[PDB]
Amino acid sequence: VSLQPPPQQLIVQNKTIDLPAVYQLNGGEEANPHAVKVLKELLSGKQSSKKGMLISIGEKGDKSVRKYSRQIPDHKEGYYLSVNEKEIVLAGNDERGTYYALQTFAQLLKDGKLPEVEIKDYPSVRYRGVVEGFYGTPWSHQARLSQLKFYGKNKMNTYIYGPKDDPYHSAPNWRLPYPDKEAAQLQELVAVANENEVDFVWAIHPGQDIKWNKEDRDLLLAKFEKMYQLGVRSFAVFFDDISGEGTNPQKQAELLNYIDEKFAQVKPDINQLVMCPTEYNKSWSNPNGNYLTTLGDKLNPSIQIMWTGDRVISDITRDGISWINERIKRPAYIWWNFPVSDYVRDHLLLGPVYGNDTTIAKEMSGFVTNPMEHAESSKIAIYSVASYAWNPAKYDTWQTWKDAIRTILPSAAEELECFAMHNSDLGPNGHGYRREESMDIQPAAERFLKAFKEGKNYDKADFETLQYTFERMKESADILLMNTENKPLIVEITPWVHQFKLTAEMGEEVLKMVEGRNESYFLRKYNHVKALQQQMFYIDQTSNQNPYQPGVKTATRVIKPLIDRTFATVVKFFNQKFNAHLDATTDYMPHKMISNVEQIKNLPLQVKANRVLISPANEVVKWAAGNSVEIELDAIYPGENIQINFGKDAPCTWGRLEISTDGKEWKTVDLKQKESRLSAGLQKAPVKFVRFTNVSDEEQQVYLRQFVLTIEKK
């Protein structure tokens, strides 16, 4: 909170110094000009004189800091920083070290005053930064310019450019030079990266269609030469998430070594050469171990090999990094898949960075984070990874999280903390990765509520905590929506902020239902909750409409389940007490589904874009002779298709699929095998009802893997 990342060595005195009114600057002409520019901005409108306070800036060896050469740590990007009443020393082991001394100096400066301090500092991990490596909308040019400035402040020296959906990076145009517009933007990003002491690493992802021939080898080197002409001085080749011949480890190694020997080692000034393997995590690695040992043994040793840990999404352990390092014969260059949300695109991941061993710096060549498509939102994790990677031995997860939020939005830090504390879990996903959320209120929640489902009074304080939490959520939502200090951050999170405010309002009303003294008041709160459920549906259908995980989920771990369970319970109790028939459903769904199949009838419908689907069942479905499922839409729509998967990859001989506009006249629609599932085209036929009946004489055992109606788009 004093300093981020925290220095390796810091000795502070209880004496403070004034940023001097008058200063003699020694070394300004010879020290790293990027560092000298930061110094001059910090000394703006102070007197530069041949007899003021001495400020010494330089790299080790420079006349200006010869005197302190014994104090400068002998580590790449290391520096010595000194403030006393006599003078200030800003001494890099190298040019980047001098820049980093200034990034520390800048944080020490509190309202014209400096602490009396001795700092010897350097990074524990050699390469630290970000891989823009996710699926989805690449970062905007303005977002990237903002990222590079943020990296320089937090001593991250690496930006690996590799957005999966950039067609000049991957499938299908990796062979083509960037068009003039994009090329000019990349040239500007490279110049800005250099000015912030960041290595811009341009990656290529050629594996899905690469031929192991001269034509494609030359086009890959020609593309690298064009990027070099734009100023790029670090390069990567990625072979992740591909199939086919491009997965051949001997050919991958031969290509990387060719690039090394004919390009990387021939230019005077290429820094990093990095490759991402096809087997990039332990789980998806073939047990013969031959893929990874082939790379380890054949790839030139200066070449970096990236690794995501024990699974596609995982935290880095001592055992896990030892496992990879033994096979690739060098320290892994970690690709950490957090806070990347490209497989949970309906969630923001704004929680702290944790889970990575703090003792394994010597076992890694580098550590980069793959972030969200929300660039500013990712700064919380990026700031935290910068801190971890520079000084893992002192890494303080929770304080660093707070420091990041206070850095990103000083004007509304407590509101951003409130929002982030309840927007940190991923929810259930195919990669199995979860994070903690709402941990502080969870105990007051669990027993305000296991009690309610059974027992007694529950406690005036597990009610004031939940009421307080909803009140704080609304304050935070409304202040964040109107915040003008980081407009790009507010644009990213706004849809979630809307949903978060509605969650908090629904909670306040549901608690008013629990407090409910008379029937009339209770019905008013009930009707209000039903309206808030509808509003949350409409935000979910109109916000963040991507093809994969459309819509907006928030406060999913603890708060939404507490509110939904408490509403369903208080409604059950009202129905019992007043012999009423109030609907206890917690998610608004305008369409209806009925079944006499035990394992289907309680599955909720979901709307995703122009799809209306039955939530897939985990359990074996027992489908009796004559039993059926029927969907009723809220209106007649033109139909596109129906897709069904029963887990058989075979024709469905026993089932009759029908559509209707009135649920009186039915038209049979023929299911055809398609891509291992069943599909029936509807050819724009009007549909309001969909019905599937077991017309055989026998019970059928299936899984409800998929049951989806697609209707004509708005």
Ligand X SMILES: CC(=O)N[C@H]1CN2/C(=N/Cc3ccccc3)SC[C@@H]2[C@@H](O)[C@@H]1O
Segment interacting with its own copies, rule: CB under 8 A, options 295-303, 457-465, 470-478, 654-662 = 470-478
Q: Which of 209, 216, 241, 357 is catalytic?
A: 241
The partner in contact with residue 228, picked from Ca ion, ligand X, its own copies, none with C-beta cut-offs of 5 to 8 angstroms by kind, is none
The residue among 62 and 363 lying less far from Ca ion, judged by its C-beta, is 62
Does residue 484 belong to the site contacting its own copies (CB under 8 A)?
Answer: yes
Closest CA to 702 of 634, 644, 642, 639: 644
* Contact partner, 527, from Ca ion, ligand X, its own copies, none, Cβ < 5-8 Å per class: its own copies
Binding-site partner at residue 532 among its own copies, Ca ion, ligand X, none, CB < 5 to 8 Å by type? its own copies
Q: With binding defined as CB under 8 A, does residue 326 bind its own copies?
A: no
Residue 94 sits in the site that holds Ca ion (CB under 5 A): no
Annotation marks residue 310 as catalytic? no
Quick check: 524 binds its own copies (CB under 8 A)? yes
Q: End-to-end CA distance of the chain, in Å?
A: 50
Residue 134 CB, shortest distance to ligand X, in Å, is: 4
- The rounded distance, in Å, linking the Cα atoms of 692 and 703 is 15
Q: Tell me how far apart the alpha carbons of residues 489 and 541 are, in angstroms, rounded to a whole number.
A: 22
Query: CA-CA distances (angstroms) from residue 440 to 191, 329, 419, 552?
Result: 44, 44, 14, 23
- Select the residue interacting with Ca ion from 23, 38, 60, 62 (CB under 5 A): 62
Sign of CA dihedral 438, 440, 443, 444: negative
> Can you give the C-alpha Rg of the chain in angstroms?
30
Q: What is the dihedral of CA 581, 586, 588, 594, to 10 degrees?
A: -60
Residue from 538, 578, 598, 673 binding its own copies (CB under 8 A): 538
479 belongs to the binding site for its own copies (CB under 8 A): yes
Beta pairing partners, 26 = 56
- The C-alpha atoms of residue 369 and residue 351 are separated, in whole angstroms, by 14
164 assigned binding-site residue: yes
Residue 534 contact partner, candidates Ca ion, ligand X, its own copies, none, CB within 5 to 8 A by sort of partner: its own copies
**Interface residues toward ligand X, by CB under 6 A:** 133-135, 164, 240-241, 276, 280, 308, 312, 335, 337, 340, 342-343, 370
Give the Cα separation of 301 and 155 in Å (integer): 26
Least distance in angstroms from the C-beta of 280 to ligand X? 4
Tell me the backbone φ, ψ of residue 570, rounded to 5 degrees.
-65, -30
DSSP notation for 600-623: TTTPPEEEETTEEEEPPPSSPEEE
Q: Determine whether the annotation assigns residue 335 to a binding site.
A: yes
133 labelled binding-site residue: yes
Up-side HSE of residue 413: CA atoms within 13 Å toward CB?
10
What is the DSSP track for 494-517? Answer: HHHHHHHHHHHHHHHHHHHHHT--
Q: Considering Cα of 551, then 553, then 554, then 560, what sign does the dihedral take?
A: positive
Give whichever of 25 and 340 is closer to ligand X, judged by the CB atom: 340
Segment contacting its own copies by CB under 8 A, of 310-318, 471-479, 565-573, 593-601: 471-479
Among 53, 55, 59, 644, binds Ca ion (CB under 5 A): 59
342 is in an annotated binding site: yes
217: partner contacted, choices ligand X, its own copies, Ca ion, none (Cβ within 5-8 A by kind) = none
When asked if residue 413 is in the footprint of its own copies (CB under 8 A), the reply is: no
Is-contact 566 452, C-beta < 8 A? yes
Q: Is 271 in the site for its own copies (CB under 8 A)?
A: no
Among the residue ranges 9-17, 110-118, 522-530, 574-582, the one whose residues contact its own copies (CB under 8 A) = 522-530
Among Ca ion, its own copies, ligand X, none, partner that 330 touches (CB below 5 to 8 angstroms by kind): none
Q: Indicate the burial class of 218 (C-beta count within 10 angstroms; 0-12, 13-18, 19 or more).
A: exposed
The option from its own copies, Ca ion, ligand X, none interacting with 312 (CB < 5 to 8 A, set by class) reads ligand X
Q: Please check if 538 is assigned to a binding site.
A: no
Say how far apart CA 374 and CA 362 lie, in whole Å. Answer: 31
Q: Which residues, at least 6 apart from 279, have a Cβ–Cβ distance to it below 8 Å? A: 285, 286, 291, 292
Q: Examine residue 33 and tell whether it contacts Ca ion (CB under 5 A).
A: no
Residues placed in the known binding site for a protein: 133, 164, 240, 280, 335-337, 342, 370
Residues placed in the known binding site: 133, 164, 240, 280, 335-337, 342, 370
Which active-site residues does the annotation give? 241
